[model samples]
Target: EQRRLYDQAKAALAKGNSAPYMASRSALRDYPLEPYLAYDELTHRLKSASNEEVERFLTEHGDLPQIGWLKLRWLRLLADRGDWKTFVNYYDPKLNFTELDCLYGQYQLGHGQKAEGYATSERLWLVGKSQPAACDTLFGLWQGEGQLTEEKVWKRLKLAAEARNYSLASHLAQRLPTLGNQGALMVSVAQNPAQLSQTGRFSQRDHATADVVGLGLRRLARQDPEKALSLLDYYSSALPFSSDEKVAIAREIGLSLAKRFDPRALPLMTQYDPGLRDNTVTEWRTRLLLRLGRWDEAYALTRKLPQDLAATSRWRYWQARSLQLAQPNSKEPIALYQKLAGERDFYGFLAADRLSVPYKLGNRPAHIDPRVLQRVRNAASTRRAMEFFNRGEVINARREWYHAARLFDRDELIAQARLAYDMQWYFPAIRSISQAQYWDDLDIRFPMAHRATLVREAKNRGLHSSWIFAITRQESAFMSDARSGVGATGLMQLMPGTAKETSRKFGIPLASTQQLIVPDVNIRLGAAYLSQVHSQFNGNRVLASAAYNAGPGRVRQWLKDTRHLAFDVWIETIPFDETRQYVQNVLSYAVIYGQKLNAPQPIVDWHERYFDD
Candidate 1:
């Protein structure tokens, strides 16, 4: 009866049927899970409840691990009502959340702690984005006390200007006396960026002048690379801008042009001294050289990289590739490949393929003694976390696990991970093991949960099960309830729109977000989507994975803009850092899963068969 009421109450809350929700909660008042039921009721009521009502409920159950979510909502309410006393009393400085921190600063200023408030406000004021509205009250008080001078305002405006917060920069400038219009003019150029090419804008050498011209040039570079390039050389000669400023401007335009796969990016980048080039610049330049089939030049440039930068797996793999193309079947390239094949990452897996070695898993299982397991299970925090997990409060369980695991040493963490693995708590087990730096326990970390479903879905869609497993591991780590910041839900982390569209083809009814949390449904939708993207990209998993993260339109744009090049070079030159890394990680995980599945043809074999042409 209690379980029925609890389910009904939750369902009612989901549908916004508050009256039934309240009645069901009343019926479950004395159940063992009464606190959870009570929390659900309060969450629904708090939508229209008074601040005192929120305060009352929080005081009652505030010590629970689940209370953190409720506390943030309550703090928001307190801050909204300008109830500084209560807000200050409840604020935990450890959270260090920006909005709450600004509210605390407001509270301090209102309560005769002006010096501390001023210091806090100064720190907050140095940001690029406009601070919360609560911050405005605090800033007003600080300014009245003579702390916010024209120089301070200009300093913040420059920071905002650099971050491309034109509105915020303009607002800060309005706070200045004589140069208010000048600040507005700079912000105007920031908005209509082509205006910086006007006769006198780049002639000035002030920091404000440089900020405007640099931002404008970056904007122009995106729209018309030819014009930006011509203006760049013209400004460098005519303007008295500092060398550092000139290099900064050039780097921006160079990166922009490189992203567009512009041929002129090579010469534009070469004009700047190598000292001004960062790792990203050098990497892109190498990518451009490779795109144009200038392998010998790329080989020299790779060798020219600084010792630490060149020694990284990414650089090492590229240098080996360079050597392979420039001097085919070279022993030096094989030596580099051997060094990387021992590690476990995207580059490592790719390197292993070059050496014709099985993917180096390095699986070292934890020695799970009964005594150690018992001790870990008996720990107070561990028990609390387990209880939350048992009750399906996974978010709170994860929080408790994070807090508890921090108190354990490496060996203890290993024991905890072993225990979690025994309980089939795969996510926390992998997290704990990884935190302990115990990387070799691939069996426990990469569990074959829902294997039959994954196999059936992959086979039905003509997709590789390894690719399915790889994507699932990266997306949610097999957590069915996982939801990303962008509302991608479930094991495969499908966005709502994608899930709905994919579900139609699979005949799966995805009526609500709750349906996406079903592992089988998620796997089906995700596999179907992957098959679609793979077909669209002509069986290219590299392009398909990039499309998965950054969308198909952007991937199409990249392919269209870029010249016909080697697949690896195309991946390295991908404009978005996130998409590039995503493709690498997904492919690497696919290779590992391929080995685990004992596929007839491994990824290394498949790569040679499919891409060797």
Candidate 2:
């Protein structure tokens, strides 16, 4: 009878009739999804809904993850109706969206909150990207009050140009008194940064002209550091580039060169970044030296690093390496390696390999109070999320799950993750634990789902089962029904094209794309695809991993471009952020899986020590 009423209420809500839903509301009050039905009814008739009705609904069922959208609609309605007073009533700290914040700022300005309104306007105007049209009124008042200075306009123009919002930069340029047509030149410089290599386009040294030159050269550096270096010579005598601006330009140039392992990078960084203020610049400077085997120079740089930088595992490990490489007989590295080997991460695994110790699988499972667990398990949000998941409404299920997790403190979040794991919702559990910044629990994060299929696929492919497990774990976090935004589906995230090609190459009969989600087929085809990539890169698992995430063509291009790079150096400087991290995680997780599966191996085999690019 309750199910019948729910079906009727859902049916009525779907077809724009709230009367039947209202009648069934009392009867279905105890239903797990009653709040969703009430939400649907209220949203369906929001145009005619009262403020009291919406507020009361929120008061009763605000914990629903989807309730925020209903509140969003309700607030916008009030704003559209010029009911700022009522908007303020509905406004909580959570709805601090830019458009509504601008409305609230305007309301405050009109209601004797001048100082606060001006402060809000100043912040809204200073952003590099454009704000909503609602901000215009607040900005106009601020401008009328003489708060919009030429210096401020110039600052935002630089910001917008740097952010690559040329349209916004162009719009901001007109606000300056002396920068009318010259403002268009900023857009043109942003459009074609290389144009600043030649002269006469910007002849004057007056009124933020150097700003344009510096901006263009800084941008040009990222594209062609060599050209930007020469152009720095071309205009070095022409423009009075501020000391700070010169530092900025050199930082980009040095970073660009370091990204490609260009020899000039170290010299430029040594000259401009003497203070070692930028961590990225400093790290690259060190990594560049490490790549070239300049152990003595690398040692000197490590000695000068800020204490915090030197103490970080990345630099500390490298520092120990530098000392060992420079002296060869140095015993100092052992102590450092011993300390790092216990941490359980990519570098920690490397340290353990150095010390010839077992990988530390730091698995500390959360033991929460059963009372807390029971209360959380029985909470309406938990029930709502679980019901949605069971019903296969995953989109809604995820919303409720994350929203419910958001309401918890870190300890409570651990309990939430524990609950999710017990429910066998692996993805949500992994994500919830991650949100709590808790990482020691490997069993929850690295579930051995579909183990038999992965082991079979690895055996068939003549590959390590751990490698297959690592790829699947990193690719989908063991979510069997996962799908990427680009239409890659299932546990291994196989694109249909890749799966079909693998199917064809292996002479396996795959009848349809839907088969890609089946555990056996996805693992089989994913293994076949990985084998193909590994063969293309001469069995270098690191390159194969890169090729899997990025294309084979991209990894090939990277190898051709970078010659004689160490395995770690080449991996670090791969240019694609996603591919770089993906390769590292896959390699690290492979080592983890090896130990977990009692098939321990080095981070890479001795044969895979150098890329020989």
Candidate 3:
């Protein structure tokens, strides 16, 4: 009888009928042991079922370990009761369970027994040291006991920062001496900038006056110049003032003032060198001038600048306008527009569009250029040889090819390669960019480099840099111009809807795809999203990574089953094949990055082997 109902349910499901519903109805009444009956029961009971119903659903079949499906009901029951003690008992000593042990230990320390609590923390740190969030819980145990003194806090901070528990590491830095505010903050974020999602990590920490300035600078990158200006406004007064900070602060507030089309931006723009050597700084000033409709000034600032202004689209378009204003009455204006149009770069495309000129970049050669070929030869001479590469030779005068890739310094070459990449000339783009190897650079995009920003933000959020790097690599290769089939843009590959949501959440006014392509703006939005993922999943990076890739809603469903699994173990065992591989790859890259940066190896636990468990 059970077989008949099961077969019926299978046929219904295979045919796209509501099988789980029918299966639950049929199986509920029958005394049966069909393989999928437990599955159907657990599935249908979630929405309206009580904890008692869930318990019964699991207890009857929870012993079927091979299924691993019934644990969902069991774990749900434990969580429903807030029964931390029993949760530790039933679940194995996995990362999540160990975290529970730490929580229970802290609970004991607070209300019952201190030693037991410390013991729990020790056990968690012993097995879950690689898991920073778990260690953070254990750290809480130490805090409650007054054992987390300044010295001890610094010690643990060093360890966690080494382990890339940036949230904790940044927190620990508060107790240490002033280590150059910007430098320390960068180190903290470099550890795990994604940790910034927890405002507690940044806002609640001990800070010098310079620390406030550093945070304000970060906000400036996010297009929240107003907020950044406000923070600096309070700090900018009184005696001391370095020209650098003052200029930076002035640019921040002045840019905001200019973005709103204020006259003050015009004079402030002149206060700084319009020909500032740094393109980023120059770009900001040019943008302020453009906003103020000071075309002659804006045009003069950008006339000799590279086509990629390292500015926003509006800024980029105005840069084209700057060129247009150069000789608006002359035939040479068309020639200048043509020169920009011929370049296959971001601002060049905008230039071509602005001038109503057709864009025509040179085609890539069938053969690799000697310059690019030479770099490849050099890398091959070293240990970076490719296992599978197609050989070719140089045949074109186009420097944008591989050889041009080797011509410039670090940031310059990357910008050139990224422009090629934006057009999907992957081979030419790859050849050009294969030198500096932008993947590890963190800011694998155009100007306004955000690697430091990403690292800082990741750490502030208590996330692993490598993990963030890996995701950015896989998602968009950190390309700010990275537009997907679905219209996702920028370094972290935020979709339009997601970017809008981020703008709303952070209270930054945003209204176009162009804003999403700005590196500083994009990372700000991306970091906000990463923070949201951490919050939704209690700082489980694996879950957050999956959520970032898939969706938070789907991740929540998976958590219903694997809530007790250690983060790494659960990552390995994720049911979604796509998400499972994503977790492993991101973690792998993070581990490698940690090693490359001379930081500690981010182990899943001290119990695990160095690289692979």
**Local accuracy of candidate 3 as per-residue lDDT tens digits, 416-462:** 45545554444345555656554433222222235687787677767
* Per-residue lDDT over 1-613 for candidate 1, one digit per residue giving the tens place of the 0 to 100 score: 4256766666666666656656755666545444666677676566577767777777776545567777776787877887767777789877667777888887878788888999999998888888877678778878888899787887788778768897889888888886686678667766777776675755766665665566677777777776788787777666566787777677767777877877688877877747534877787888878777788988888889977778889888988888898999678888889889887877887787777887777767877677777787876567767766787887776777777787788888999888778777788888899889887888877878999999898999998789888888888888888888889998989989988888787787777767889888888888888899889877778888888889889988877744445677777778899998888878877877877888733443344233321
Question: Which structure is stronger by TM-score: 1 or 2?
Answer: 2
Best model per lDDT: 2
Per-model TM against the reference? 0.77, 0.92, 0.31
True-structure Cα RMSD, model 1: 6.2
The alpha-carbon deviation from the true structure for residue 174 of candidate 3, after best TM-score superposition, in angstroms, is 6.8
Please report how far candidate 1 places residue 536 from its true position, in Å.
1.5
After superposition on all CA atoms, what RMSD does each candidate show versus the true structure? 6.2, 2.7, 24.3
Cα error, residue 223 of model 3, in Å, equals 7.0
Q: Tell me the TM-score of model 1.
A: 0.77
TM-score of 3: 0.31
